[PDB]
Amino acid sequence: TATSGSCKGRCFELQEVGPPDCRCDNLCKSYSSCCHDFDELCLKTARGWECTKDRCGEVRNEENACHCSEDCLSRGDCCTNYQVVCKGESHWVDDDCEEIKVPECPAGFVRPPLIIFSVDGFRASYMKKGSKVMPNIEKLRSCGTHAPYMRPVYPTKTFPNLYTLATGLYPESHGIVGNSMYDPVFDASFHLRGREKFNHRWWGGQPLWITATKQGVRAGTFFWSVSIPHERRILTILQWLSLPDNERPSVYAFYSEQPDFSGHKYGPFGPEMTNPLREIDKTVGQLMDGLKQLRLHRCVNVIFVGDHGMEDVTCDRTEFLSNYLTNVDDITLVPGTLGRIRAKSINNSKYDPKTIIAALTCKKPDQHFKPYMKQHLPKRLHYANNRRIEDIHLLVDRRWHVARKPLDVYKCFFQGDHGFDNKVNSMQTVFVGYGPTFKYRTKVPPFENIELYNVMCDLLGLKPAPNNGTHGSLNHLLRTNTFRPTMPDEVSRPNYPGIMYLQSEFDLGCTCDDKVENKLEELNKRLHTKGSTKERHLLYGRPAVLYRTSYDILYHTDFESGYSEIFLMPLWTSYTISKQAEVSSIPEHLTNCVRPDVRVSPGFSQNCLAYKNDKQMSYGFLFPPYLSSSPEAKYDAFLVTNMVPMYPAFKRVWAYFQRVLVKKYASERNGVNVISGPIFDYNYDGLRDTEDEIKQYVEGSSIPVPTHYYSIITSCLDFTQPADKCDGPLSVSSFILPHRPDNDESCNSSEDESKWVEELMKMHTARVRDIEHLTGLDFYRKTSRSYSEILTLKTYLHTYES
Ligand SMILES: *[C@@H]1O[C@H](CO)[C@@H](O[C@@H]2O[C@H](CO)[C@@H](O[C@@H]3O[C@H](CO[C@H]4O[C@H](CO)[C@@H](O)[C@H](O[C@H]5O[C@H](CO)[C@@H](O)[C@H](O)[C@@H]5O[C@H]5O[C@H](CO)[C@@H](O)[C@H](O)[C@@H]5O)[C@@H]4O)[C@@H](O)[C@H](O[C@H]4O[C@H](CO)[C@@H](O)[C@H](O)[C@@H]4O[C@H]4O[C@H](CO)[C@@H](O)[C@H](O)[C@@H]4O)[C@@H]3O)[C@H](O)[C@H]2NC(C)=O)[C@H](O)[C@H]1NC(C)=O
Ligand SMILES: Cn1c(C#N)cnc1COc1cc(Cl)c(C#N)cc1C(C)(C)C
Ligand SMILES: [Ca+2]
Numbered sequence: 001t002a003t004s005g006s007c008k009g010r011c012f013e014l015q016e017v018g019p020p021d022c023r024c025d026n027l028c029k030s031y032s033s034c035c036h037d038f039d040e041l042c043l044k045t046a047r048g049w050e051c052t053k054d055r056c057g058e059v060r061n062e063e064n065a066c067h068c069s070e071d072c073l074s075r076g077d078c079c080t081n082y083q084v085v086c087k088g089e090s091h092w093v094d095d096d097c098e099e100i101k102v103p104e105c106p107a108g109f110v111r112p113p114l115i116i117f118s119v120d121g122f123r124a125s126y127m128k129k130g131s132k133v134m135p136n137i138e139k140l141r142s143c144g145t146h147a148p149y150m151r152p153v154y155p156t157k158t159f160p161n162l163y164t165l166a167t168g169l170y171p172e173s174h175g176i177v178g179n180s181m182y183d184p185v186f187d188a189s190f191h192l193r194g195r196e197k198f199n200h201r202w203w204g205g206q207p208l209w210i211t212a213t214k215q216g217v218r219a220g221t222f223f224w225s226v227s228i229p230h231e232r233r234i235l236t237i238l239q240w241l242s243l244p245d246n247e248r249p250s251v252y253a254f255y256s257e258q259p260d261f262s263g264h265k266y267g268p269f270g271p272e273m274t275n276p277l278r279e280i281d282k283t284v285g286q287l288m289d290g291l292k293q294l295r296l297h298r299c300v301n302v303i304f305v306g307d308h309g310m311e312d313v314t315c316d317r318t319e320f321l322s323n324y325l326t327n328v329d330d331i332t333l334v335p336g337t338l339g340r341i342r343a344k345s346i347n348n349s350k351y352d353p354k355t356i357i358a359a360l361t362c363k364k365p366d367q368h369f370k371p372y373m374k375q376h377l378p379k380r381l382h383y384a385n386n387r388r389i390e391d392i393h394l395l396v397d398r399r400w401h402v403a404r405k406p407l408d409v410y411k412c413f414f415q416g417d418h419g420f421d422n423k424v425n426s427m428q429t430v431f432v433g434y435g436p437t438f439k440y441r442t443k444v445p446p447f448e449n450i451e452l453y454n455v456m457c458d459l460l461g462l463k464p465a466p467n468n469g470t471h472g473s474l475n476h477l478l479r480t481n482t483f484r485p486t487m488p489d490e491v492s493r494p495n496y497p498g499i500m501y502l503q504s505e506f507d508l509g510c511t512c513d514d515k516v517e518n519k520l521e522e523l524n525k526r527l528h529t530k531g532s533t534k535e536r537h538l539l540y541g542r543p544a545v546l547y548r549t550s551y552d553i554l555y556h557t558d559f560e561s562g563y564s565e566i567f568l569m570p571l572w573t574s575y576t577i578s579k580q581a582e583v584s585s586i587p588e589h590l591t592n593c594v595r596p597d598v599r600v601s602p603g604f605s606q607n608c609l610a611y612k613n614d615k616q617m618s619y620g621f622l623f624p625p626y627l628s629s630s631p632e633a634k635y636d637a638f639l640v641t642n643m644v645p646m647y648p649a650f651k652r653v654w655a656y657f658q659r660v661l662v663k664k665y666a667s668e669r670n671g672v673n674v675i676s677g678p679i680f681d682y683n684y685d686g687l688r689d690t691e692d693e694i695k696q697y698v699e700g701s702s703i704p705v706p707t708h709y710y711s712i713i714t715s716c717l718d719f720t721q722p723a724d725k726c727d728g729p730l731s732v733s734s735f736i737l738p739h740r741p742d743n744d745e746s747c748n749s750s751e752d753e754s755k756w757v758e759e760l761m762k763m764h765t766a767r768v769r770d771i772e773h774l775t776g777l778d779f780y781r782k783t784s785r786s787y788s789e790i791l792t793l794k795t796y797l798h799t800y801e802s
């Protein structure tokens with residue numbers, strides 16, 4: 001760096017200059033490459049940040065941090081309180097809220113600017129609890145559009161979340177999978193301290209600033225050097241906004257290190273937290289007074305957003321791997337509010353992950369972490385498909401830490417931390433949108449930060465890069481510039497087989513003990529098999545298969561299914577259980593009954609003999625025999641086309657769901673509609689496997705083994721209407737349960753299922769959209785609701801927090 005070129009005329013230049021020409025953009029500080037006079041010219045502080053009566057009308061003096069002279073507004077560099085102090089205008093916070101129906105912008109603005117105001121560690125409940133000391137923020141919140149909270153991504157750390165906001169991507173796709181990382185392809189490490197984090201190969205996807213630039217829209221800086229004071233960041237944004245039309249950016253970011261920085265020292269609600277909240281609110285007032293001075297306060301869209309919350313954690317709530325493993329120096333742990341384990345050295349072939357897992361599993365009765373192979377983590381976390389994520393993972397209980405040994409923690413500092421499971425209440429953060437493009441005085445439901453990239457693109461007239469948002473699911477935040485998606489086109493149309501095979505054509509090894517014989521009830525069973533009850537059981541139309549495959553629709557009195565001829569089982573099975581329905585047992589004449597389905601050939605069917613031979617694998621049913629409507633209909637549940645492969649350990653789970661919980665939910669929700677099926681994700685990418693990806697079959701057959709079993713449980717949001725006769729919006733909960741040959745995940749599993757199955761199921765709660773990615777199906781195709789509303793429903797996650 002030839003650091004005696006000047007920064008005069010160039011302070012906070014938007015375009016970078018190449019070495020050895022010295023840099024005046026921020027970042028120069030983080031690369032130790034600013035011109036000599038950067039601090040003198042670009043970080044002025046003389047006289048501070050506010051006009052006072054004496055300074056009014058002063059003679060411009062270029063030394064001052066900001067100006068109170070007559071020319072300041074045309075120059076764009078007044079102190080933010082200049083009109084208040086010198087011109088008897090009011091602060092923005094003191095003005096009544098007035099609806100912003102249309103952008104009210106100076107001439108030459110082609111679109112409303114967007115300012116992203118990101119606040120580190122701003123936990124959701126600060127909006128209520130800190131309301132009395134945050135008047136600027138409360139005005140934004142109550143006059144704009146807000147959610148009660150915003151769900152971050154896992155892990156609930158800073159870079160992963162801010163880079164998710166910027167990209168629309170899950171950490172596993174963008175690459176920033178933690179605040180610290182090892183990449184084995186690069187054989188390189190990423191850390192908070194230092195300079196390797198600045199290398200571009202860490203940062204995948206396409207962040208907003210590049211999407212903007214590629215499409216002709218200019219962007220301010222996103223990263224601010226920590227030494228640049230907040231008042232200077234604000235003033236710099238206001239200055240940029242005064243630029244001429246061909247130079248002026250349309251998108252800006254402000255970042256605050258608070259309240260996170262104090263939160264770590266004092267805890268989320270320590271009495272010392274009041275002042276950091278006051279100071280953030282002041283900064284917001286500065287921006288808004290600044291915008292008002294420039295006539296931009298009814299022209300800009302402002303997004304007030306956090307990265308994550310903050311929880312109470314102290315040194316004494318640390319679990320030590322040294323209390324579990326005697327081999328502790330054979331491993332490297334990424335420690336803290338999550339754990340990631342790999343081998344200390346890759347030439348130590350002694351190392352065995354399964355013995356590590358086994359040594360970490362349910363060893364102390366209150367153990368405050370749980371070990372997982374990463375493919376076995378809750379699919380809702382989307383935290384597996386990246387080489388930077390170690391195969392072994394520890395999910396840590398809220399309020400706790402994990403470390404390798406006690407010398408790591410005592411060689412106490414802190415009272416707050418974050419990083420936990422992203423459904424945890426303390427990790428939730430905030431969203432407020434304010435401006436012409438946002439709605440007025442509107443509350444919207446909680447949503448995930450992965451959704452914002454699409455909105456930010458909508459706000460700016462950009463086409464979003466491919467991302468994990470569901471574009472349109474946040475249209476209800478927006479006054480206009482909505483994105484109007486169409487439903488994906490069905491790729492494969494189903495077959496509707498009739499009766500084509502005789503009983504004796506099947507050699508299955510299946511006994512069913514069922515021979516016992518009317519003409520009233522013959523046309524009656526015929527019409528059920530042709531789809532007469534189908535409107536009762538298929539409430540929202542059939543799911544659409546979005547890939548090329550061969551399948552059949554099979555109708556029955558109590559349930560309807562799309563049966564895959566390639567996978568030899570259903571892709572989905574749909575049934576409705578009313579509030580009035582009764583549970584019955586499986587009779588004795590039918591316990592090991594499996595019956596041929598005479599609509600589907602022997603060659604596209606499963607067989608019992610494969611199950612008998614497979615000593616690890618048994619079978620269950622997608623439509624549960626327990627809930628059949630009549631003894632005649634119960635025969636249908638024993639069709640071989642309703643059977644699926646299940647480990648006996650998983651059958652404990654599945655039986656309890658089918659026998660107890662479904663009926664419970666129908667009572668609580670006034671009927672439910674259920675869609676259940678299998679999921680195959682052997683490469684843990686969150687997407688449906690092709691047949692050639694499947695790693696496990698039922699011994700000696702072509703029957704593929706699911707990695708997971710899903711269910712989607714839909715009812716009427718107004719629960720006074722029964723599920724099958726609902727006029728308005730819907731209510732959904734779903735899960736994606738791991739199909740595991742043991743219940744090691746559930747420490748209490750030796751007890752009766754009412755003590756542990758429901759807990760397992762809540763941990764594996766899912767969005768409908770997660771199931772779609774995993775199955776290639778598109779649900780809710782025929783409802784009376786608008787498509788955007790259905791998109792919102794598909795992104796809903798039932799979290800089971802209070
Ligand atoms: C969330 O949303 C995202 C974004 O939409 C979804 O991720 C996409 O998933 C797609 C489907 O899996 C995937 O498409 C593949 O792309 C390959 C080309 O990828 C490069 O170019 C793109 C475009 O600029 C870029 O986005 C990619 O960036 C990744 O890679 C770099 C470094 O590796 C990272 O810095 C970056 O973070 C990102 O990493 C992530 O993605 C990769 C996978 O691409 C993961 O491995 C990482 O862990 C991380 O998650 C790339 O720079 C392309 O090569 C693929 O094509 C194969 O597939 C078919 C097979 O029939 C064939 O037509 C092709 O020829 C090719 O097959 C051949 O190669 C095979 C593999 O080498 C080989 O086995 C065969 O034998 C064949 O010869 C494929 O099209 C797309 O890249 C990602 N995009 C991103 C940003 O992640 C994600 O799925 C969503 N999640 C959910 C749950 O919905
Ligand atoms: C985290 N941090 C530090 C530190 N330490 C200094 N400045 C920042 C803000 O960066 C951001 C701010 C926003 Cl608002 C968005 C978004 N969207 C994205 C970023 C990244 C991180 C550049 C990706
Ligand atoms: Ca943070």
Ligand SMILES: [Ca+2]
Binds near residue numbers: 684
């Ligand atoms: Ca897959």
Ligand SMILES: [Cl-]
Binds near residue numbers: 179180
């Ligand atoms: Cl981390």
Ligand code: NA
Binds near residue numbers: 613615616
């Ligand atoms: Na068996």
Ligand code: NA
Binds near residue numbers: 743744745747749
């Ligand atoms: Na167990």
Ligand SMILES: [Zn+2]
Binds near residue numbers: 121260261264418
């Ligand atoms: Zn922090």
